[PDB]
Enzyme design. Structure first.
Site, PDB file in Angstrom:
ATOM      1  N   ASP A 242      -7.089   8.008  13.446  1.00 15.12           N
ATOM      2  CA  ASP A 242      -6.664   6.472  12.826  1.00 15.12           C
ATOM      3  C   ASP A 242      -5.382   5.845  13.006  1.00 15.12           C
ATOM      4  OD1 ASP A 242      -6.288   4.240  11.233  1.00 15.12           O
ATOM      5  OD2 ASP A 242      -7.713   4.967   9.525  1.00 15.12           O
TER       6      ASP A 242
ATOM      7  N   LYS B  25       0.973  -1.212  -0.055  1.00 16.34           N
ATOM      8  CA  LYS B  25       0.162  -0.202   0.187  1.00 16.34           C
ATOM      9  C   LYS B  25       0.791   1.339  -0.053  1.00 16.34           C
ATOM     10  CE  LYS B  25      -4.147   1.908   2.297  1.00 16.34           C
ATOM     11  NZ  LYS B  25      -5.072   1.402   3.370  1.00 16.34           N
TER      12      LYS B  25
END
Ligand SMILES: [Mg+2]
Ligand SMILES: [Mg+2]
Ligand SMILES: [Mg+2]
Lengths: 377, 262
Positions: free
Chosen positions: A197, A70
Site C-alpha cells: 500500500d 492523520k
C-alpha cells in the site's frame, strides 16, 4: 435503524466514499466531479473550506490550511513521531492536555482544533457527498484505519465520526478492506495475502491470513515518510536545478513558479508510466523565461531507486516476522495510485520471483470499496 | 456546470457580454482573471475541467485579432498549459473541435504578415505541436518557411517550426531540400536537447532512406554525425547494468546509419 450505511476511506492525503446500492458498490464523486477528495481543511475569515476548495487555496493561505492530520490523530504531544512530524508542518501545533492540536487564526484571533475535529470535518464532507447522491440523510458508516493503529487511534477515529454526525459501526483495517474489494475473502482454504500500500505520503505492507472468511493480520511494517509525493518531489528538484544551471534563477522561493512545476511534474510522472521519455515545458515560467526540459523514465527511476527499493525491506520484514516463505504468498494486492509506476510493479513482482499482483480495481479506490462492501451489514 | 471555476468564467463571460468593445478596464480585469487561474491550468484534473467547460470562450479570445496581443497570449497560454502531457485534453479538443487546428494556423500566418508578436507565434506553434497532425490537415510550407526565415533571431521559434515540419512529413509520406538543409543546421546546434536531436535526426534519416541521392546531405552534418558516433558508441561501451533502453537503441540506430544511409 442504521439507514443506508456508507464506507469511507479516510486517508492521510485523500479520502474516498462508497456505498452499496442494489447490491452494486459505487465509488461516489464529489461536488467537483472527483472520486477521491483531498484530506484538507482551510480557515478563512468568511469560510471553513473542506477538500478540493481547501487544497486549491493552500498557496496564499499556507498556515490556516490543515493537512496530514492523520499523522497526529490519537497520539500524544510528547510522542517521538509527533515531535518529528511537527517540524515539517507549515501550520501551528500546540500542546493541549498532552495531545497535539492545531491552532489557526480567524480572525485575527487564535482558534484551536483537535485532530478529532479536523478529521470530523473531513468525515462530514464525505458523508454529505453520500447524502447528495442518496436521497437522504445518512447516520452510520464503516470507517477504515491503517492496520497498525492502536486503540487510542481507533477511538479517536470513531470520535471524529461522532463529530461528523456518524455512528461508526465498525473500524476496519485498510489492507483488509482492499482484500475484500478483490473478493479475496471467498476462501476456500487458508490464503496468505500480502497487501502492498503505497500512498501519497506513507507506505504500508501487511500480511493477512484468511480462512473460513475470517481475516487476521499477521504482521505489518512500513515507512511513514515514503510516498508518491516524494517521487514527484525528485522530479521537481531535478527541474529546479536544471533551470538554475541554465538561467541563473533559483525558483525554490517562488510559490507561483513552484505550484506550476509540481503540477507539470505530476503530469510527467503519469506520462512516464506509458512512455520512455517526456518533455516538460512551461510558458513564461519566470521573468519572461520559458522552461523546457526533458525527463527519461531511466532518469526518473534512477532518481527514485533507493526510495523504490526501501519498499521491499518492509515486505521481507513482514515475511520474517510471520515465518512465511515467499512461495507461501497466494495474493499480492496493490493499493495506492503510485503502484501504477512500472518500476514499482517490476521490483515487487521480481521480488516474488515473477508472480503477478492483483490489480483490476482502481488502487486509489479499493479501500473505500471494501469499506462500502462491509457497510452492507 | 459547476465545476470549481465556474465563478471566474461566469465573470469573464459577462464582462465581455457587457460591451461589444472591451474597454481598457474590461481587458485589464480579464487579464487579472487570467493571472490568477493560470497556475491551475497545469493540473491534470483542473486543466481538463477548464477545457471541457471554457474552451469555446478560450479559443474565441485567443483568435480574436481585434484584441491586444497580451490578452490573446493569456488565453492561448491557458490552452497550452492544459494540453501538455494531458492526453484527455488533446483527445477532447481534436475531437469536439476539429476546426481549431486550421483556425490556429490561420492566425499564425496573419501574425507573420507583420512586429513581434513572436510570442503568440510560439504559443500557436506549441498548440499545433501538441495536437495530432494527419494527412487531412495538409498547413502552408511557405508560411512556415517564411516564419522560420524571418526569425533566425529566435532559435526557440525555429525549433518549434522544425518540430512541426517533422510531423507534417510523417503524415504525408509516409507513416524539399531547403528544409533538409534547416534540419541539418539545427541538429548540430549545441543548445538543442536530446529529444529534439532525435526528432531532427529521424526526419533526415527517413528523407535520406527514401529519396537517397535526390536529397543532398552536406559535409558539416557528416562531420557532426562522426563526432556523435564516437561519443555515443563510447556510451554503449561501458557499464553498468542500468541503461536507458530508449537511448541505447537510438544510439545504435545512429551509429549504423553511417554504414548504409549516410
Ligand atoms: Mg435506486
Ligand atoms: Mg541535491
Ligand atoms: Mg558541402
Amino acid at each position: 435503524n442504521y439507514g443506508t450505511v456508507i464506507g469511507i476511506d479516510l486517508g492521510t492525503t485523500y479520502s474516498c466514499v462508497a456505498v452499496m446500492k442494489n447490491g452494486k458498490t459505487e465509488i461516489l464523486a464529489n461536488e467537483q466531479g472527483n472520486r477521491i477528495t483531498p484530506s484538507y481543511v482551510a480557515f478563512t475569515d468568511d469560510e471553513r473550506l473542506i477538500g478540493d476548495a481547501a487544497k486549491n487555496q493552500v498557496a496564499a493561505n499556507p498556515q490556516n490550511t490543515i493537512f496530514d492530520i492523520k499523522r497526529l490523530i490519537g497520539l500524544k504531544y510528547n510522542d517521538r513521531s509527533v515531535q518529528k512530524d511537527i517540524k515539517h508542518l507549515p501550520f501551528n501545533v500546540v500542546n493541549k492536555d498532552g495531545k497535539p492540536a492545531v491552532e489557526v487564526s480567524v480572525k485575527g484571533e487564535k482558534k484551536v482544533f483537535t485532530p478529532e475535529e479536523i478529521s470530523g470535518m473531513i468525515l462530514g464532507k464525505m458523508k454529505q457527498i453520500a447524502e447528495d447522491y442518496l436521497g437522504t440523510k445518512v447516520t452510520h458508516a464503516v470507517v477504515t484505519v491503517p492496520a497498525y493503529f492502536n486503540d487510542a487511534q481507533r477511538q479517536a477515529t470513531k470520535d471524529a465520526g461522532t463529530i461528523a454526525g456518524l455512528n461508526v459501526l465498525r473500524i476496519v483495517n485498510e489492507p483488509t478492506a482492499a482484500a475484500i474489494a478483490y473478493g479475496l475473502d471467498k476462501s476456500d482454504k487458508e490464503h496468505q495475502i500480502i497487501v502492498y500500500d503505497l500512498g501519497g505520503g506513507t507506505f504500508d505492507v501487511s500480511l493477512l491470513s484468511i480462512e473460513n472468511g475470517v481475516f487476521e493480520v499477521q504482521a505489518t511494517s512500513g515507512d511513514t515518510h515514503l510516498g508518491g509525493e516524494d517521487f514527484d518531489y525528485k522530479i521537481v528538484r531535478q527541474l529546479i536545478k536544471a533551470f538554475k544551471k541554465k538561467h541563473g534563477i533559483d525558483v525554490s522561493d517562488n510559490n507561483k513558479a513552484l505550484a506550476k512545476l509540481k503540477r507539470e511534474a505530476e503530469k510527467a510522472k503519469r506520462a512516464l508510466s506509458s512512455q520512455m521519455s517526456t518533455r516538460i515545458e512551461i510558458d513564461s515560467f519566470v521573468d519572461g523565461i520559458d522552461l523546457s526540459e526533458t525527463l527519461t523514465r531511466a532518469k526518473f527511476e534512477e532518481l527514485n531507486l533507493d526510495l523504490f527499493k526501501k519498499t521491499l525491506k518492509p515486505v521481507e520484514k513482514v515475511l520474517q516476522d510471520s515465518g512465511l516463505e515467499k512461495k507461501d504468498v497466494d495474493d499480492i494486492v496493490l493499493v495506492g495510485g503510485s503502484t501504477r509506476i512500472p518500476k514499482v510493479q517490476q521490483l515487487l513482482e521480481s521480488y516474488f520471483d515473477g508472480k503477478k499482483a492483483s490489480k483490476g480495481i482502481n488502487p486509489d479506490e479499493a479501500v473505500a470499496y471494501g469499506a462500502a462492501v462491509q457497510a452492507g451489514v | 456546470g459547476d465545476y470549481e471555476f465556474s465563478s471566474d468564467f461566469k465573470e469573464m463571460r459577462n464582462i465581455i457580454d457587457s460591451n461589444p468593445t472591451l474597454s481598457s478596464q474590461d481587458i485589464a480585469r480579464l487579464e487579472d482573471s487570467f493571472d490568477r487561474i493560470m497556475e491551475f491550468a497545469h493540473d491534470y484534473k483542473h486543466g481538463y475541467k477548464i477545457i471541457t467547460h471554457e474552451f469555446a470562450l478560450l479559443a474565441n479570445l485567443s483568435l480574436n485579432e481585434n484584441l491586444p496581443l497580451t490578452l490573446r497570449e493569456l488565453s492561448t497560454r491557458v490552452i497550452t498549459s492544459c494540453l501538455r502531457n494531458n492526453p484527455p485534453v488533446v483527445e477532447f479538443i481534436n475531437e469536439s473541435f476539429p476546426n481549431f487546428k486550421s483556425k490556429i494556423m490561420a492566425a499564425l500566418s496573419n501574425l507573420n504578415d507583420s512586429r513581434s508578436s513572436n510570442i503568440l507565434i510560439k504559443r500557436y506553434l506549441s498548440i499545433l505541436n501538441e495536437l495530432p497532425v494527419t494527412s487531412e490537415d495538409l498547413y502552408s510550407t511557405v508560411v512556415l518557411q517564411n516564419v522560420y526565415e524571418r526569425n533566425n533571431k529566435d532559435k526557440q521559434l525555429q525549433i518549434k517550426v522544425l518540430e512541426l515540419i517533422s510531423k507534417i512529413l510523417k503524415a504525408d509520406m509516409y507513416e524539399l531540400q531547403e528544409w533538409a538543409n534547416e534540419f541539418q543546421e539545427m541538429v548540430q546546434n549545441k543548445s538543442i536537447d536530446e529529444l529534439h536531436t532525435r526528432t531532427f535526426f529521424d526526419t533526415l534519416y527517413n528523407l535520406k532512406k527514401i529519396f537517397k541521392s535526390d536529397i543532398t546531405i552536406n559535409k558539416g552534418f557528416l562531420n557532426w554525425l562522426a563526432q556523435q558516433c564516437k561519443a555515443r558508441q563510447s556510451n554503449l561501451d561501458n557499464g553498468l547494468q542500468e541503461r536507458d533502453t530508449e537511448q541505447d537503441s537510438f544510439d545504435k540506430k545512429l551509429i549504423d546509419s553511417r554504414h548504409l544511409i549516410f
